[PDB]
Amino acid sequence: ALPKGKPEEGGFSAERLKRLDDHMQTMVDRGQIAGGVTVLARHGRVVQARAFGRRVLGGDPMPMDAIFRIRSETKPVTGVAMMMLYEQGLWRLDDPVSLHIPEFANLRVAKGVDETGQPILTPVSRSPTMRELMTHTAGFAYGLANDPSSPADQAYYRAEVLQSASLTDLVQKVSGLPMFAEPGQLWRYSVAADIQGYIVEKLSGQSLPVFMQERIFTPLGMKDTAFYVPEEKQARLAALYDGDPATGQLVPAVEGAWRDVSKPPAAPLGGGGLVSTAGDFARFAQMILNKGELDGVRILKPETVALMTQNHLPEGFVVTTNGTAAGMGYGIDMAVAVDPAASGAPVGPGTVSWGGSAGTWFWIDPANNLFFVGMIQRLGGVGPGLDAQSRTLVYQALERPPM
Hints:
This protein is an alpha+beta fold. The protein has helices spanning 14-29, 74-87, 97-100, 130-134, 151-159, 167-175, 192-204, 208-217, 278-289, 302-308, 382-397; strands spanning 35-42, 45-53, 68-69, 108-113, 119-123, 241-242, 251-252, 275-276, 293-294, 297-298, 328-330, 335-337, 351-355, 361-365, 370-375. α6 (167-175) crosses α7 (192-204).
């Protein structure tokens, strides 16, 4: 559900594009992955959309409309939800977060640990701003790490923040838990998009899954994108695998029942709860390339998409792409390549990107008017390696005019 084209209509060598088909097949054969789906699109038409390997390890071949746990790749979609309430005047980037979440008045920061191993707690200098919420510079901590060397994280793990009964429960816990830092001091991946989710619910007056369906998935025809996989679509769900790369050994991953996608979640996570297909994600990516529009349907103003895909970080700050980096910045709920040449990366300046912990990746390069969506279900380093390798092979297949 995007128009198709010969690779040369997109500026590509069909021969040099096959080195990419080849690489994906080599990852199935070597048992790095069970299978996956890739979409490459330029000038609004698909030039390569392939499904390879199998949905389950023993089982049927990976269909083009496979459903994947996109995890942290949810974040930019939550970003678009927040920017719609931005356009309606319901919040400003300069607003303190405590204006929208009053409990955030009680935020305290962990400043090292006492002789009893408890964190020493100080009232926060000031509320984080919405812009710091949107850029992971608000000083909130990470919820998936039981790490005593980081008291703020250990407390989030212990309070079971991501496994909360509701988004109201989640935000109340965060308000009484130690922050990792004062707001505005550094970039650090956090539960910020999950808090963004609560702000969508509060400002919109609708639950996050209803807001995103009415205002994003339905209008853009993302027909399989949701916080769960309903019984009738359970057959298209890709299976999640783990193991060591060096050994061909793929094993089904064990992950807490809270990440389960068979039933609607009590606490929908804006940072990690979406499932989607390559086609649904591709339509989302194309909507960003078009500065807010797809097939006559406008969900964001072009000024608003331009704001999202710029670097909002201060001067010195440092990022990691993927939830699974010189010349690398961070816009509203997505990484941005400010100066890709500096790290010898092939993407165009202002390219936006992110990756989930289950190995899904995407990037959107406005300057070369193209995007890429990669879908696997593999924990560990495989996804990020595959991201890097696919970037190399795409830009190596691309023939632009010089000057």
